[PDB]
Amino acid sequence: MNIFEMLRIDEGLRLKIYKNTEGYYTIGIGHLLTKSPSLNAAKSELDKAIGRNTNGVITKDEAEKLFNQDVDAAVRGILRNAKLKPVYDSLDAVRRAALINMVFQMGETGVAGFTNSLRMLQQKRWDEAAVNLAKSRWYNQTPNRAKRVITTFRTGTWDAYGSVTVVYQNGLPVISVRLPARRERCQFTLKPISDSVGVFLRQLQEEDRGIDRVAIYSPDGVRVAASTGIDLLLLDDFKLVINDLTYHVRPPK
């Protein structure tokens, strides 16, 4: 787990233009296009960012490239900023990623407005920061995200985020999932030919009382049919949604 997997979870993946929860036009993995309320302003901005005529639509490659630029921008924004850099340099990798997340969501300047929180973080005072961050326009606008980001600063662990990975062992695919607020990782061995998506999903549910929703989607956000055999599933990437969160899974081969 790292900054890129973390932001994938927080931000999801969309190949069409959409309104985020603040209601601004966005695409890709959390790429804000404009704060303008015009959809043409937004299509216009997209075309500039990609360097072609998209008609509001991009490819998975274009999303990852853009995402990669935005993260880079966010790190370079921290290093150029005089309030942010000291804090960033004091922090371990996991807490650094929490900060970059914040910068990525609300810019260099919004984040430097958090003078007390930042001081507390520099001073190693993890709960006092957490409590303080928890009282902010940020937390109010996007509380679920903010809680996750705050838990990362509080703890210095990846506990608020989850996981999904796919590995072969004996020629069988093995899927491991660590859920948010869970110490234990859990794994699932499937039979490629005879097992299907729905079988795997029912097992996922069976494993934890805390799961109220599970689904698989293509990267395009189209639901994969439950009856689809696991061998077909693993020919490409897919999105596994578990409660609120989405995990972009990238099987080998």
User: Residue 126's closest CA among 95, 163, 84?
Assistant: 95
| Quoted resolution (Å) | 2.8
Instruction: Please say whether the beta carbons of 239 and 216 come within 8 A.
Output: yes
- The 8-class DSSP code of residue 184 comes to -
What's the length of the chain?
A: 253
CA distance 219 to 247: 10
Farthest CA pair distance, the chain: 58
Could you give the angle at the alpha carbon of 191 between the alpha carbons of 189 and 192, nearest 5°? 115
What is the chain's Cα-based Rg? Answer: 19
- The 8-class DSSP code of residue 52 comes to S
For the chain, report the end-to-end CA distance as a whole number of angstroms. 21
From the number of C-beta atoms within 10 Å of its C-beta (0-12, 13-18, 19+), residue 198 rates as middle
- Give strand pairing partners of 163: 178
Provide the H-helix boundaries in 81-221. Answer: 84-90, 93-112, 115-122, 126-133, 137-141, 143-155, 197-207
Instruction: Please say whether the beta carbons of 226 and 201 come within 8 A.
Output: yes
Instruction: Please say whether the beta carbons of 151 and 160 come within 8 A.
Output: yes
Obtained via which technique? Answer: X-ray
DSSP H/E element including 248: strand 245-249
Give Cβ neighbours of residue 84 (< 8 Å, ≥ 6 apart).
77, 78, 99, 103, 108, 111, 112, 118
CA distance 34 to 176: 38
